[PDB]
Nucleic acid binder design. Structure first.
Lengths: 295, 81, 289, 81, 289, 295
DNA sequence: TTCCCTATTTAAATTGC
DNA sequence: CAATTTAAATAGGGAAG
């Protein structure tokens, strides 16, 4: 079924599940496998995504790209993309990198603004932990959690170098892993190659975190290779640098409580897309990158 | 000149094109004839596969070439089927 | 495990028309309107540039984008190409690409290199007969394109620099090989429909040079009124003036069909490693820093 | 680089070989894949042909010389069955 | 019907072991394995030689010997061949060759002109390896035996004088390719087996250079007490000691089986057109008047 | 089945049809398709001929090359040659040329006894007509036949030019065709291009007599390329010379009777082969060449 | 797409010749 | 010596998810 997901102010990102897409009566429509045909709105829709089970005709492609809709392709749930043209201001008359690209490369090429943007994205990591509250896992308002939050805030506000910020992020992730592990009372140590259910579940949640991060950066049309925390040679470091907002506050409690129950990966995917829609986190990352770029 | 015949025709006419191109080439993969040959022999094959009767479907490939293509049911555009 | 060939190791291509790029036993098959399925070489395809009547399946789009074969729509002002995004591209090349796009003095040099790569494709891909490659009528057009792209004072200055080169090449090919077809998109013949499914094949070897090696189509080398379409159209114009229009003119002069022109374009891109040249040429300008 | 693959195996292994080589070469007819792969591409194609396992009946061809051949029963000077 | 493609561009040559050569579906064949029937291209086949446990029936013979394709047999030594005869071969070559060949001075001149052609067989075919074109010993020995056939006192003075050449090239190619084998028709090692099976390539090329152009062989050159077989060994040894001996020492040195050795000599025949060379090479001795 | 042909003094040309010749107990024997194996004599054999269905092996060929025989392949009727080895003095001790072309092209390279051999070979064409008789068709002892024998004897004797000889041969061919036609009460002219039964039986008989030429020259080591009457550029002119000894004598009434009584081509070949084996025509051609050779 | 038909093209084997 | 069978045999199809 079709899904509405907020980007900035209107539900302009459409997720189109199992169907066939074609031109009907001189306008772009789509036909599900149950026999029900739906058209599209055009002023409502700016972004249209396609999931497993779809095919779009070229006439519909040209009519969508003719007067101001940009199509994209994605995995199941709409929160990991693999094929997309990249965003312009108006996709027909002009072709240039966006003003989000413009202010983002201004803050990337300015070293003081580079460090200020790094401090601000860790400050939004603070605000993501303080904002996204969950009934499971640790409580963000207790003594230990908020003490580690205050220690991180002192760490970012008193740091100058990039490696100091990386060390603060490192003790943040090990500390948060320790208290989340203490919440369900099993000892853990982080390693990517651990083939247990808990670590593979956390890497799956991390995968959908980089998917929602990539959908956020494509939603502003900004690329994937201008990181703030990781180095310039890190493979897709900007995707991790926007995803670690969500790994430390959303992916860790969801994946950790769901692998406490140990249910299936496909239903975890469905629940992750459901929480991504209900919390409306993609628009929160657009709000984050908009307040970084506009300063 | 290493040329390469690939036939696509049928059951009965494939036996005749076998008998008239394995005289000139050598069968390797399932229908893929290949071997060294002359251009005079190339013209001789073109003559005796005009004179094989209608219903043959054969394309020759001297390395990367479409040298003679007599008969066609459906070639799917760029060098395929 | 399964390291796979790079986009600089992919030589097959396709510009499918009236097709249906579906999933057939894991192979991305472009099934045309006749009733047969052309199994495209998905890992070795630069792209599968769709035309009118083509429906690209979602799992087929997944197998195309995962193997770095960025499908595109051809039917240029409005030609949207779905570049591959899940497989993360070269971050060292892409980070220095914006640093060579944001600085206007560096953006001018990057645009000059990306538009003078067309002159480097008429001398590397030397499979051009009829109008030749040193006949001083097509080589003169390539030299004039290089002279126009050498300055490249702004992205809006030489925005339509490839358009004049394509017009000169299409005029010289017609004046040489006995024709009078001009630059048109709806002049239905064997000539103007040859360099409209041949330039789509030139965008076939351009969407694999910006989905694995290069940065993106958003930051283009040419921007302006007559520079709409993206940097894929600025990577196709390197191969359009050397491997698309000369092959189309040779097929029109020899009376070949559109399928023969498509096979000739795919074989000339495979033998000259034109997709590999585009993939290794985008990395030269991007990863120069 | 111009190589050519013929598969002589049995089902369902032959469909698997079709899936592996059809990602690298376009199909011509009655199992003779044909086209252009770089040498590292032929090396990793050999690697996935090894990872297919037993039962593979593939002989390659670089012009007339056999570039590689994985699995065989009888293949003389000519290459006929 | 047809022009019946000329033997000086015939392009295949075969030795078979443990088979039953016959016609299946109008096609002369192999039976190398138990049920593995192959195909012989009689319009390109120079010759079909047959090892132990082999036989060719009459339908294969009648289909085969209609355009100049011989059969001889393996078990140097005594060999009865089968040249095509119902094809009325051109007469001028054999008229002029008996016109010289009765006169023992002009027969001696024919022997000295076909026996000096060892150097020409090393001259038009140069792509070797190891000892290559010259190891500063093979050029010397072929030069002294060129002078030895340049003198040419009598036919019985050179009855087994070429046998010294073949044994000195057996033990001249072995001082650099390390083995101490000797000439034996029943030795089970790789060197003697390969160098014996290559004599059955040389005999086929020689007898098919005589069958098509016109000489019936048994009217001999280099007759005596040891060189038994006729003019065929006076034409087979042109390519034996110059062409098939280096490839035989290669294949016995690299240590691969007989089939890929025969592939190497089939390719060396095909890319250099060696019975073409042997057709217009003895025509410069036959047609010469 | 083994079928015999005499050549010089002893019956030695055994013809094998439809058999598998291989080594039985260290000796060359032939297994026919009926299932019975028969051996071959050795000291009685110099020529051995393989008709259709005949397969010989390699170890058998090795013994046959080791102990003194020459083997040949042959077509239908076991007589028409297509694939052969050649005749030497002795194939094991010394491989020296057979003396028949020694005598014959010694007498040919000088013009005077070459012309003597030409008039002698038209003399044995005359002897082929006068010697060999049939029970049907034209009697060789009537007025017209004896008249054209006397006219041809005169026309062979006085002349010294080969143009007069070939004109006499053409006059003989046309005149004998006219008398043979009026004996069968029809009017006819020879044409190779006509496809009637009479002309095609003449052409098939001419081809089979070309076969008897090529076989009788192979039995002595003389070759098919050496004409006496036709020119040096005529391919196989000696074959058309030696067949013209018989083409007016035995092939002509057999073919004319086969065309008159209307049998098929294969049984006409069988009747020709029966006449060729019963009245030793090959041996008479050997005797002809041997008396033309030694002079 | 994995999967299962399922028409096919297809051989080489039979098999006189 | 080709006179034809039988299949070794694949995309080519429908579903599906």
């Amino acid at each position: 079924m079709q899904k509405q997901i907020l980007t900035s102010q209107k539900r302009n990102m459409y997720i189109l599940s199992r169907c066939k897409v074609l031109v009907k009566n001189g306008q772009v429509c789509h036909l599900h496998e149950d026999g029900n045909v739906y058209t599209v709105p055009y002023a409502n829709t700016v972004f249209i995504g396609l999931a497993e089970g779809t095919s779009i005709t070229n006439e519909a492609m040209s009519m969508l790209a003719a007067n101001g809709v940009i199509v994209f392709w994605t995995k199941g749930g709409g929160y990991d993309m693999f094929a997309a043209d990249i965003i312009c201001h108006l996709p027909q008359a002009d072709y240039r990198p966006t003003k989000y690209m413009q202010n983002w490369v201004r803050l990337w090429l300015d070293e003081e603004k580079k460090l200020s943007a790094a401090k601000e994205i860790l400050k939004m990591r603070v605000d993501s932990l303080s904002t996204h509250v969950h009934d499971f896992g640790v409580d963000v308002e207790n003594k230990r959690v908020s003490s580690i939050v205050n220690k991180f805030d002192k760490g970012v506000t008193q740091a100058t170098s990039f490696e100091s910020l990386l060390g603060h992020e490192g003790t943040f992730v090990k500390s948060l892993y320790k208290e989340y592990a203490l919440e369900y009372e099993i000892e853990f140590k982080r390693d990517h190659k651990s083939a247990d259910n808990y670590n593979k579940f956390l890497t799956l949640g991390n995968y959908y975190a980089y998917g929602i991060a990539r959908s956020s950066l494509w939603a502003l049309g900004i690329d994937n290779s201008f990181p703030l925390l990781h180095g310039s040679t890190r493979r897709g470091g900007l995707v991790f640098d926007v995803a670690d907002i969500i790994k430390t506050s959303i992916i860790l409690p969801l994946a950790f409580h769901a692998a406490d129950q140990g249910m299936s990966n496909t239903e975890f995917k469905r629940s992750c897309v459901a929480y991504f829609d209900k919390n409306d986190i993609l628009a929160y990352l657009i709000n984050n990158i908009k307040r970084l770029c506009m300063e | 000149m290493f040329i390469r015949i690939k036939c696509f025709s049928k059951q009965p006419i494939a036996k005749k094109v076998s008998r008239e191109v394995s005289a000139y080439l050598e069968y390797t993969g399932n229908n893929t004839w290949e071997g060294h040959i002359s251009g005079q022999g190339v013209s001789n094959l073109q003559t005796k596969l005009i004179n094989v009767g209608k219903g043959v479907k054969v394309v020759c490939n001297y390395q990367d070439k479409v040298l003679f293509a007599i008969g066609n049911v459906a070639m799917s555009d760029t060098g395929s089927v």
